[PDB]
Design a protein around this nucleic acid. Structure first.
Ligand SMILES: [Mg+2]
Ligand SMILES: [Mg+2]
Ligand SMILES: [Mg+2]
Ligand SMILES: [Zn+2]
Lengths: 100, 83, 67, 129, 33, 72, 220, 209, 113
RNA sequence: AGUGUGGAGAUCGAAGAUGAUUAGAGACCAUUGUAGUCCACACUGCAAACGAUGACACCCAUGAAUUGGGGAUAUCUUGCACGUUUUCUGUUUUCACGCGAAAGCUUUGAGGUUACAGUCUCAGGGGGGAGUACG
């Protein structure tokens, strides 16, 4: 029984032969780049409470100069994406909903 | 019209209706088929006793093309003006 | 095996069911053994209280129409 | 590539009739296709049609009247003697009261009833009903 | 999780068993000849 | 899109049927000789023999019995 | 007694509609089973039971059993109907299938093989009906042939009024639920095939509900 | 519609009828365009909206009134509207012509033993999308449908469509005025020369609060 | 002191329909009225009904309540083009190019906007 | 992946070694480590080598999107990009008619087939024994 039309990846029939694999962020499993789950993350360096204490002690970081952030692109294998709550299983009728 | 025995009488009961647009028989189980009567109007603008009747098969309505079919039927019948 | 046939209303639970239901049972002697038969009947109400109870059902409310 | 012009045209007409269309364009055309259409016209299964010249194999526009149920070609074109008409009638026709099998004979292209009357055989081209 | 019921034992390992058997038979025939 | 159709294509159709008839288990058995050699009867309906001894054969599960037989 | 609910049922009670052909003419649904037995004499509508079997549903600590019944009705003169229903006991299922069969009555067209002498005796053209994997094909036959079919399709064709026919079944005919419906669908298709005898146009008619609309308002 | 068996000009759009249409902007639609209503579009105005050809809109309307006429017992026509902007525009329409109205419960046209079981002869709706249940039910019981449709209306099980804007409060009540007036003129209660006495403010809807 | 059962809620609605003019926002007077106009066995049920009836009366003072239909005050509240002719239609250019294509030409009192 | 002959040898790492888990643990985990992994030349010819869907040709409903070229007539930098509408080729997404046992397919077919014929070609005929034995 075919479960998904796209077979869980982004490679239609007459498009491509092979896609280079990448390592999963957590476990390191090799998986094709078009099949891995990908996110872009922009997280604050410090929590809200600790940022205030550092900003108070800093001649540089006040109210007209924000602190730097971290920018990372994350790709996970299927198993690591599910366990880490990034992606969860959906009912048969709801598997088609795609966000951006 | 219908089947004759060659004895002189009709052996075919219930000669069915034919769709105006496509000239196809309308079966007894076609519950989407409809019949519409359009009033005739006298010269003064008041309706007349006579009416114009047409039938549409169910397949056309389900496809969503009955509106287009009705327009061409009335243009040919001269019920409404093309321009 | 056991078989049941029913029709209409039938109240269970609570205490009022002993007043509104009439029940009986018997044993019948076939050639193979004993057979049980039970019958329960939901009595309609009555103003006298002979062919039924006098009080209404415990959870039925009726609003008398104004003059 | 395209191997049979007649088979291509008859398939196009049958589909348009099934979809309830009023006109159908046929391309390319040939002498055999025109003769087949005239047999259909004589028996009242299609309306008028127009042949357009383009200095190549031309095109045909046919008017449909809703009376056609199915038309098709027979490939390969098997030989049919005068004693084989009954066999072909029982195999590809809905009944013995209507429908025609079209043949090509030494006397020209005609339906099976006309061919039998003139006592001639030939090769089967197609059918319609 | 991705496959129906095989019967016997993982087919790839069954094939590996047959491969080793054929090698042993080849060696025995070679010794005799 | 499963078979050839040409008017002068009889040779291909004849060869195709000849090779595919061998896949029929019943057809192959009647046209080869291995079964006849295997059959203790030489293709006959009956045969005669000498009894060697009497044996009992256990019935296959889920039945349970001792079926009486002889070896000939 | 019978108190009609639909407008069609009230009309047949008032005898404004007398023939089943008028209802077939306007392709209207029959929702009360007393309509068809009013317009057909009680001495000519024959019914019969075809198959009853149990179906089951798994349940925690046990399983649940019901019964399904198939019924066929007809007058052996060009009318046929089939119905099927499911009940908790065989008695209840049998009764409900009789009602459903009456509500599914369709007309059957009949014709001649070759020469046209006497009453029509066979179907006018080849037809096939399909349900599930089962397909039944009917072919016109000469006068002395009789019904050439399996025992289940043969019974249905007798109730419809066909004397001579050739049949052919295609796949998994032991599924009698699908086999019964496939035979019914093939017969129903006989009145939808346009033939040269039905080419000319006819004058339009008026709906029974339009003719007696004033009386229909009065009854309610 | 406008064409008559006897050569006449009575059932033709005059200047006064057209004037009202531009007054309430009934000729404008939305930005999206259904493929089934391409025949009623004229062009794209500013901001991306579509213009409806008033000539064909008039022909559809007068055809609709001619169908509504010659039906005895006006109660055989039910007028439904799931939109809230036509909740009273349907009542004032029915209060003048005598048709049935309602403004849905699945099974109304199909459940015979239901208490509210009615089988009208002709159905009139306000928006095919928002009245999908109504028109879908009508398809099992041979009931024709007449609908007020926009540029993006699915024309399934819809036989007569009047291309007009059924989104604004003004436009919805504006359209029922023509339909009510035309049938009365065809019936003969009023005369064409005199102006229609009824005014659109009763048809116009207002906030219930 | 919890959710009200549907037998209580249906009874309270029936009381308000037929006896609206006899009730007010007081539980103790409302209870006296209900003990006269309803026949029931349970005293406890009559207390719950008198409680929810008082709740409905308070909501009805603010505004309408779904599921009531007093049908005596709703009717009173229900009974309680020349403006744009003077202003001018002022249709856009795309419409203007279509108005004159008709058999009546450009209608009177129009602009370009 | 493997084999031969010359190079290379950072990383990772079949075989093997040493710690831990465990009743046992030869495994999963940790630290390592040989062949390999990389290059040149010469072999091998197997993959869930998959769209599990052979090649060529015709008809076919609607709206999007997108890659390359061409035709016609608003924005921005100073020839380019962009806007609107057509067009040829490619490449995809929203239960079209219809088909199918269903899951599903649908201008891109698994449609146009008991109303069974456009052309060529490969393979199958209950489950095993068996892709084994012999040549
Ligand atoms: Mg690959
Ligand atoms: Mg471990
Ligand atoms: Mg290492
Ligand atoms: Zn992972």
């Amino acid at each position: 029984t075919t479960k998904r039309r796209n077979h869980g990846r982004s490679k239609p029939a007459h498009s491509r032969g092979r896609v280079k694999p990448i390592h999963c962020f957590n476990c390191g499993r090799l998986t094709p780049k078009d099949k891995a789950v990908g996110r872009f993350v922009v997280r604050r360096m410090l929590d809200a409470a600790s940022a205030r204490d550092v900003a108070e002690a800093s001649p540089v970081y006040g109210a007209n100069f924000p602190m730097p952030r971290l920018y990372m692109k994350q790709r996970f294998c299927i198993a690591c994406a599910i366990h880490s709550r990034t992606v969860r299983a959906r009912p048969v009728g709801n598997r088609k909903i795609r966000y951006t | 019209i219908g089947m004759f025995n060659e004895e002189g009488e009709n052996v075919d009961l219930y000669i069915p209706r034919k769709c105006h647009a496509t000239t196809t028989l309308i079966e007894a189980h076609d519950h989407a088929a409809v019949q519409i009567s359009i009033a005739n109007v006298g010269p003064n603008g008041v309706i007349n006793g006579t009416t114009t009747t047409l039938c549409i098969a169910g397949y056309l309505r389900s496809q969503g093309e009955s509106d287009h079919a009705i327009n061409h039927i009335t243009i040919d019948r001269g019920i409404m003006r093309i321009k | 095996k056991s078989m049941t046939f029913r029709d209409g209303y039938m109240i269970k639970s609570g205490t009022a069911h002993k007043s509104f239901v009439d029940s009986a049972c018997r044993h019948c002697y076939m050639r193979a053994g004993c057979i049980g038969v039970k019958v329960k009947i939901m009595l309609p109400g009555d103003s006298t209280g002979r062919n039924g109870p006098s009080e209404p059902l415990p959870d039925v409310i009726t609003v008398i129409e104004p003059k | 590539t395209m191997m049979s012009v007649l088979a291509n045209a008859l398939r196009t007409i049958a589909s348009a009739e099934r979809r309830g269309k009023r006109q159908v364009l046929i391309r390319p055309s040939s002498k055999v296709v025109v003769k087949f259409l005239q047999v259909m016209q004589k028996h009242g299964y299609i309306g008028e049609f127009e042949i357009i010249d383009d200095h190549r194999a031309g095109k045909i526009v046919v008017n449909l009247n809703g009376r056609l149920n199915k038309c098709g070609a027979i490939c390969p074109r098997f030989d049919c003697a005068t004693t084989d008409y009954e066999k072909w009638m029982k195999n590809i026709l809905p009944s013995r009261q209507f429908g025609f099998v079209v043949l090509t004979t030494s006397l020209g292209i005609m339906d099976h009833e006309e061919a039998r009357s003139r006592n001639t055989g030939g090769k089967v081209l197609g059918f319609f009903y | 999780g991705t496959v129906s019921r095989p019967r016997g034992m993982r087919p790839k390992w069954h094939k590996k068993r047959i491969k080793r058997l054929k090698l042993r038979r080849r060696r025995m025939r070679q010794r005799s000849k | 899109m499963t078979k050839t159709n040409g008017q002068n294509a009889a040779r291909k159709l004849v060869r195709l049927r000849c090779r595919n008839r061998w896949a029929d288990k019943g057809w192959k058995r009647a046209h080869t000789f291995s079964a006849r050699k295997a059959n203790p009867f030489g293709g006959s309906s009956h045969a005669k023999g000498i009894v060697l001894e009497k044996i009992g054969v256990g019935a296959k599960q889920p039945n349970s019995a001792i079926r009486k037989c002889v070896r000939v | 007694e019978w108190v009609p609910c639909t407008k069609l049922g009230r009309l047949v009670k008032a005898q404004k509609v007398t023939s089943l052909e008028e209802i077939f003419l306007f392709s209207m649904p029959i929702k009360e089973h007393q309509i068809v037995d009013t317009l057909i004499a009680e001495g000519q509508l024959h019914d019969e039971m075809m198959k009853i079997y149990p179906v089951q549903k798994a349940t925690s600590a046990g399983q649940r059993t019901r019964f399904k019944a198939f019924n066929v009705v007809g007058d052996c003169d060009g009318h046929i109907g089939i119905g099927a229903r499911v009940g908790k006991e065989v008695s209840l299922a049998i009764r409900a299938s009789m009602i459903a069969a009456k509500l599914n009555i369709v007309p059957v067209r009949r014709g001649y093989w070759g020469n046209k002498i006497g009453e029509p005796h066979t179907i006018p053209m080849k037809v096939t009906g399909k349900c599930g994997s089962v397909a039944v094909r009917l072919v016109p036959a000469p006068r002395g042939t009789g019904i050439v079919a399996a025992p289940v399709p043969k019974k249905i064709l007798e109730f419809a009024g066909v004397e001579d026919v050739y049949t052919s079944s295609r796949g998994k005919t032991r599924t009698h639920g699908n086999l019964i419906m496939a035979t019914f669908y093939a017969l129903r298709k006989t009145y939808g095939f346009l033939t040269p005898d039905l080419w000319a146009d006819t004058e339009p008619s008026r709906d029974p509900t339009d003719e007696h609309a004033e009386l229909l308002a009065e009854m309610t | 519609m406008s064409a008559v068996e006897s050569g006449s000009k009575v059932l033709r759009m005059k200047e006064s009828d057209a004037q009202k249409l531009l007054a309430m902007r009934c000729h404008i639609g939305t930005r999206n365009q259904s493929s089934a209503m391409k025949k009623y579009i004229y062009g794209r105005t500013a901001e991306g909206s579509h213009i409806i050809d008033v000539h064909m809109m008039w022909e559809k309307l007068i055809l609709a009134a001619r169908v509504i006429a010659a039906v005895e017992n006006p109660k055989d026509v039910c007028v439904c509207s799931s939109r809230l902007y036509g909740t009273r525009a349907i009542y004032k329409f029915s209060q003048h012509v005598g048709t049935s109205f309602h403004g849905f419960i699945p099974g109304t046209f199909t459940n015979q033993i239901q208490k509210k079981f009615v089988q009208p002869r002709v159905l009139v709706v306000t928006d095919p999308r928002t009245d999908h249940q109504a028109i879908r039910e009508a398809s099992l019981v041979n009931i024709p449908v007449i609908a007020l449709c926009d540029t993006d209306a699915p024309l399934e099980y819809v036989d007569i469509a009047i291309p007009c804007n059924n989104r604004g409060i003004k436009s919805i009540g504006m359209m029922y005025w023509l339909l009510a007036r035309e049938v009365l003129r065809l019936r003969g209660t009023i005369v064409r020369s005199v102006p229609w006495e009824e005014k659109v403010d009763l048809f116009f809807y207002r906030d219930p609060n | 002191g919890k959710i009200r059962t549907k037998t209580v809620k249906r009874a309270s609605r029936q009381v308000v329909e037929k006896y609206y003019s006899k009730l007010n926002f007081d539980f103790y007077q409302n209870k006296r009225v209900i003990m006269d106009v309803t026949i029931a066995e349970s005293k406890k049920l009559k207390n719950k009904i008198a409680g929810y009836t008082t709740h409905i009366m308070k909501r009805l003072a603010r505004g309408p309540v779904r599921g009531i239909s007093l049908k005596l005050q709703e009717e009173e509240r229900e009974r309680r083009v020349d403006k744009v002719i003077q202003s001018g239609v002022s249709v856009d250019k795309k419409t203007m190019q279509m108005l004159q294509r008709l058999e009546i030409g450009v209608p009177r009192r129009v602009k370009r906007a």
